[PDB]
Design a protein around this nucleic acid. Structure first.
Ligand SMILES: Nc1nc2c(ncn2[C@@H]2O[C@H](COP(=O)(O)OP(=O)(O)CP(=O)(O)O)[C@@H](O)[C@H]2O)c(=O)[nH]1
Ligand code: MET
Ligand SMILES: [Mg+2]
Ligand SMILES: [Zn+2]
Lengths: 470, 134, 86
RNA sequence: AGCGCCGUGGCGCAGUGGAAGCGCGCAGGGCUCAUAACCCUGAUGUCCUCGGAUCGAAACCGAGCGGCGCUACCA
RNA sequence: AAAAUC
């Protein structure tokens, strides 16, 4: 006769709950699979891609259970602009008796270390093999800056295809190709509509998709039939995630850095402002741990245009007040995840889409901002994301001087002007600043049909730097 | 490799055949009583029941479509106008296509809810989040 | 949003009036009333109705004809525009 | 989530502090040969619910509800 | 004056 809350609390207290991370553990013995890390912070960022109106957030809600906050009363229904973040924990059943496909289970991040197996008749306890962060990239043909920023954030991929619709969806191919542009190859194929398909039709669809992914760089892409609605074949997805995708190399031997992709202002209205919190920049940490209380600087920061039209860039210095990596504030941070670094930054810097795709460095390092950038660029044969009713899918042309091109340098979305074009290299003038740390893998999109269409990939080889003014 | 994909396809087809042996043609013929100047629908209760829709939402939809303000008697929708049966049939079909049945699946199992304050349709067999409010 | 529909109002001696409610502002209204008048030989009014909007009232009882003008002038949909029997 | 607007007798506005208003409707009648126009007649309410100063309140306030509007998705 | 139908 126990209530649901009482049963949940009993399972939580049986399983150990969520132990607090040690304040200053020995970081030379701390792998991404340690209990202090695995139980309370993500180490792998896996992201979902698919064409418009497919249920990209619904599949992640099925896997994890946490909503992406599809906001704005107009993005409620059609498309989101900002990404959809989600946390799920991969738990395997320790008893060999239960079937291997059903051994795995993705739960919410509120779960404990050892939850009991919900399978009827199984007394085993679940072991957390990994907790993974989820990134959802909107797939609309005007909003591609967010998808490329996410791809720069990405570490693992999940591609989605609809059944009853046409096999060659341009947007799914665009997402795939953009993923292989960003040095990403762990891609898993997901067919969502199997419930509304027949025995034979899904076979021709899978044949067409197999023929589709034959010449692209990624070859070993497993295919998973899922249901965002019937909520089945989820444990198989988790098993494939754990097996096929290992951890990209990441340790604590590299200097810290941050790539802020979202802006979040903690301004709970109605209450007195005598009790407020810090302004939070949501960013991916691709390298370098952070600990509770640090001095950091957003390198692009203040961008002003003086009385001559010249650009002045002041890094935004800030002391880190909190690190909302997970539901409870953590003492440290782990590379390869999304963390909300809450500093003393004024919340209006985080109110709107302002801290979108910017680069941030800890004190003791000086990431260099650049105004003119030398770029080595390679291009694809034909445009992608365009539907052609049977006539020679449009071929990507060559660049021309003095034109605006959306140059997504990792997360930074800039409209660059091409000063010169060579056989493989070009010079870009940026009206919006970008800072070059190591390589910052670039993607390029050209305005050919009104909206942007991706063209190819690029790498920074040189640049013309600007000195920050403290 | 697509070999371990057909096994999960077959398992999913098995679970569908176990769970949904049915997989609407459950639209009652609309009965429109013409009484001089008055147009009566003594069957709108059955329309609401068979379409799994609350009556007042259906009335709101009808009077957002048509330019009238009519009353309800206890179970029956009575209005004062000269309205044909074809119009009632077509508004029922439009309500079915845009509200009642899923626009991505063949299902009526959705019902009416309010997610910040707007009507946000949610299903029961599939549970997909799609919403139409006009 | 912005649905389009036409209504008929009768009068004494079988004479009738037609109203299209909701008109896109991409093309202006006087330039459209000019060519309504010739193709229809009926009087027309750009009347203001509160909480309703600008209405191009026309004489006669014509629905396929205003629709046939709509298909050519600005309308490219022929799905949102609704025809009322009455 | 926060602050602005509203609460019919079918619909709107008005009074808000002597306790049920008007027009629009609806119904009937009269005008007439006959339709509009016009002229008469009605029958519908804790004017959203719960408390309070008040001889008194639907009205003045408030402790909550429903629907609209802006801030804006507010880690 | 406004006048309508037929
Ligand atoms: N048949 C079916 N419909 C689904 C499924 N998931 C979502 N839908 C429906 O299809 C639409 C897509 O869902 P939604 O989550 O809004 O799409 P999205 O993938 O977020 C859109 P984008 O790709 O542009 O980011 C919705 O209207 C929803 O009702 C699914 O698994 N099956
Ligand atoms: C709970 S912090 C994670 C991101 C946030 N839910 C958005 O918006
Ligand atoms: Mg989304
Ligand atoms: Zn559905």
């Amino acid at each position: 006769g126990e209530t649901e809350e009482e049963k949940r609390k009993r399972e939580f207290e049986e399983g150990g709950g969520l132990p607090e991370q040690p304040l200053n553990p020995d970081f030379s013995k701390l792998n991404p699979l340690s209990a202090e890390i695995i139980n309370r912070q993500a180490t792998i960022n896996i992201g979902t891609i698919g064409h418009v109106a497919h249920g990209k957030s619904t599949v992640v809600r099925a896997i994890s259970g946490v909503q992406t906050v599809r906001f704005k009363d107009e993005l409620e229904r059609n498309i989101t602009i900002k990404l959809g973040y989600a946390n799920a924990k991969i738990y395997k059943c320790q008893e060999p008796t239960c079937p291997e496909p059903d051994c795995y289970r993705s739960f919410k991040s509120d779960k404990e270390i050892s939850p009991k197996c919900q399978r009827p008749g199984c007394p085993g306890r679940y072991k957390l093999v990994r907790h993974v962060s989820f990134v959802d990239c909107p797939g609309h043909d005007i909003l591609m800056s967010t998808m490329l920023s996410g791809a720069a954030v990405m570490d693992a991929a999940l591609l989605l295809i609809a059944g009853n619709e046409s096999c060659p969806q341009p947007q799914t191919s665009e997402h795939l190709a953009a993923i292989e542009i960003m040095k990403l190859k762990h891609v898993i194929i997901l067919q969502n509509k199997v419930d509304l398909m027949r025995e034979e039709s899904a076979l021709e669809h899978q044949k067409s998709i197999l023929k589709f992914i034959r010449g692209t760089i990624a070859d070993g892409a497993p295919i998973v039939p899922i249901s965002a609605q019937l909520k089945y074949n989820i444990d198989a997805v988790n098993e494939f995630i754990v097996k096929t995708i290992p951890v990209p190399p990441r340790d604590f031997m590299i200097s810290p850095r941050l790539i802020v992709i979202r802006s979040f202002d903690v301004n709970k209205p109605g209450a007195e402002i005598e009790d407020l919190k810090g302004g939070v920049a949501g960013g991916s940490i691709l390298n370098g741990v952070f600990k509770l209380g640090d001095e950091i600087e957003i390198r692009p920061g203040i961008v002003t245009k003086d009385d001559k039209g010249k650009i002045q860039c002041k890094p935004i210095f800030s002391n880190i007040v909190s690190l909302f990596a997970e539901q409870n504030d953590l003492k440290f941070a782990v590379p390869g995840g999304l963390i909300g670094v809450g500093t003393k930054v004024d919340p209006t810097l985080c109110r709107a889409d302002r801290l979108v795709g910017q680069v941030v460095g800890a004190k003791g390092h000086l990431p260099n901002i650049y105004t003119d950038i030398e770029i080595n660029y390679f291009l694809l044969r034909r445009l992608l994301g365009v539907k052609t009713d049977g006539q020679k899918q449009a071929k990507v042309r060559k660049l021309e001087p003095n034109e605006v091109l959306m140059v997504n340098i990792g997360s930074t979305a800039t409209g660059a002007r091409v000063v010169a074009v060579k056989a493989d290299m070009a010079r870009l003038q940026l009206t919006s600043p970008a800072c070059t740390e190591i390589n910052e893998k670039i993607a390029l999109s050209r305005r050919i049909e009104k909206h942007w269409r991706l063209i190819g990939w690029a790498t920074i080889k040189k640049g013309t730097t600007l000195e920050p003014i403290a | 490799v697509g070999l371990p994909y057909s096994e999960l396809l077959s398992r999913f087809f098995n679970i569908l055949r176990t769970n949904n042996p049915e997989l609407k043609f459950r639209i009652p013929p609309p009965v429109c009583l013409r009484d001089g100047k008055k147009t009566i629908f003594s069957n709108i209760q059955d329309i609401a029941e068979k379409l799994h829709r609350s009556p007042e939402h259906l009335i709101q939809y009808l009077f957002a479509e048509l330019g009238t303000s009519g009353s309800v008697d206890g179970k029956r929708l009575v209005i004062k106008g000269k309205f044909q049966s074809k119009q009632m049939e077509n508004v029922l079909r439009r309500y079915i296509l845009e509200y009642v049945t899923c626009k991505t699946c063949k299902s009526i199992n959705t019902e009416l809810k309010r997610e910040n304050r707007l009507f946000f349709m949610v299903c029961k067999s599939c549970g997909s989040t799609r919403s139409v409010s006009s | 949003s912005n649905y389009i529909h036409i209504r008929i109002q009768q009068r004494n001696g079988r004479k009738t009036l037609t109203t299209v409610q909701g008109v896109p502002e991409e093309y202006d209204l006087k330039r459209i009333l000019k060519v309504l008048k010739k193709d229809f030989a009926c009087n027309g009014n750009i009347v203001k109705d509160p909480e309703m909007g600008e209405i191009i009232q026309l004489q006669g009882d014509q629905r396929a004809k205003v629709c046939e003008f709509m298909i050519s002038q600005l309308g490219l949909q022929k799905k949102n525009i609704k025809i009322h029997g009455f």
